[PDB]
């Protein structure tokens, strides 16, 4: 029996344009625990991306933190990919600064 | 003071044909992770993962490691076991999570102690409040009691979770404590948004604070916005500290009718902010 | 510290 993983995609500190930052990419509430996980800028898979260890919470269900370090603009798009077992196909969540 | 825990989460992955299982133990003191021990090394050994915990000596890690190493190929037996009970092909990926700890109240006496089992993520057997006897969730998990009554193990483990479960919560906390009681305020502000038409979204940012546990509310005037406030998860900055948000959608100039309270442990009263267009 | 578990 699988657990569908949440998604949220969000910087570290407040977005503001031309200031390096980091980008989150905090996956909740899914088993097994086997999970793929990119994220892309503009279309592009970003190569340097860190992993939290994983760990589990009381309901059983697996958690990880993915980040990269970024510099946001204006123009520029972020999402990050999940893949799971649960899901016939990846899960993309795009970046929105406003969140 | 409150109540205090020591608490293991562990894990054992079946990757059939692509090697062993994957194991993996946490240690967690008041639900911070201060040990663990990750299979997928060399010389996989049990490791610190808070600063108090360097204190322990040679003797402690290799103690612990040993402990670990062992705990993992008998759960890399239980993987097999279980594709008995449950008559599973050998090919699959299986998992089996155990929770094993004890809470303890500022007394320093036992508040409760446990230890629960999950297979695929589904409970699977669990120690009762009285540490006395197991709850099955399955027929397959009705075995396994058996096999831990007849060869007698729920006071083996009654044992550990009133003593030395007890004793090593006391001896971390008083070495954890300055760290574990650690404390950040939440810095918080308003931002606002566009909406279609005559509406605009309000939303309430608690950010860089811990523990992670609080609450945002927003206010019309002295009633709380039960319905249709919009807030996430509680997340991890990455730096130790959590952020939060939580936000209504207002008419269009009657967003000084609605105020944020954010409410945090630690801080010397509950905020309360309202937009502020510069 | 940590116990040992039963095999299952």
Redesign the interface.
């Known amino acids: 029996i699988q657990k569908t993983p949440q998604i949220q995609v969000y910087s570290r500190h407040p977005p503001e344009n031309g200031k390096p930052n980091i980008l989150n990419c905090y996956v909740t509430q899914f088993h097994p625990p086997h999970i793929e996980i990119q994220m892309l800028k503009n279309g592009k898979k970003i190569p340097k991306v860190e992993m939290s260890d994983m760990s589990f919470s009381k309901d059983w269900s697996f958690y990880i933190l993915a980040h990269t370090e970024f510099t946001p603009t204006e123009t520029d798009t972020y999402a990050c990919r999940v893949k799971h077992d649960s899901m016939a196909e990846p899960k993309t969540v795009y970046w929105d600064r406003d969140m | 003071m409150g109540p205090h825990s020591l608490r293991?989460?562990?894990?054992a992955?079946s990757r059939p044909g692509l090697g062993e299982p994957r194991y993996?133990?946490?240690?967690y003191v008041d639900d911070t992770?201060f040990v663990?021990f990750?299979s997928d090394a060399e010389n996989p050994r049990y490791e610190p993962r808070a600063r108090w915990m360097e204190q322990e000596g040679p003797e402690?890690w290799e103690?612990?490691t040993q402990?670990?190493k062992?705990?993992e190929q008998?759960?890399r037996?239980?993987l097999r076991?279980?594709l008995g009970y449950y008559n599973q092909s050998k090919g699959g990926?299986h998992?089996?999570?155990?929770?094993?700890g004890c809470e303890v109240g500022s007394d320093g006496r036992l508040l409760r102690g446990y230890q629960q089992?999950?297979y695929?993520?589904?409970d699977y057997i669990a120690l009762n409040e009285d540490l006395k006897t197991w709850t099955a969730a399955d027929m397959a998990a009705l075995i396994?009691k058996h096999?831990?009554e007849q060869?007698g193990?729920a006071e083996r483990?009654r044992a550990?979770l009133e003593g030395?479960?007890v004793e090593?919560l006391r001896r971390y906390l008083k070495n954890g404590n300055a760290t574990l009681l650690r404390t950040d305020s939440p810095k918080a502000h308003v931002?606002h948004?566009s909406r279609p038409e005559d509406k605009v979204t309000l939303?309430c940012?608690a950010?860089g604070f811990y523990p992670a546990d609080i609450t945002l509310t927003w206010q019309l005037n002295g009633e709380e916005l039960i319905q249709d406030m919009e807030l996430?998860?509680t997340?991890?900055?990455?730096?130790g500290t959590f952020?939060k948000?939580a936000s209504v959608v207002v008419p269009l100039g009657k967003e000084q009718y609605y105020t944020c309270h954010v409410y945090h442990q630690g801080l010397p009263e509950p905020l309360t902010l309202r937009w502020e267009p510069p | 510290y940590t116990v040992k578990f039963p095999n299952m």
């Open positions: 293991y989460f562990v894990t992955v993996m133990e946490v240690g992770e663990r990750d402690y103690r612990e402990k670990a062992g705990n008998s759960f037996v239980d076991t279980l990926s998992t089996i999570q155990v929770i094993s089992y999950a695929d993520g589904c396994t096999k831990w060869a193990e483990l550990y030395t479960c090593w931002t948004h939303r940012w950010l996430v998860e997340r991890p900055a990455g730096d952020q948000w």
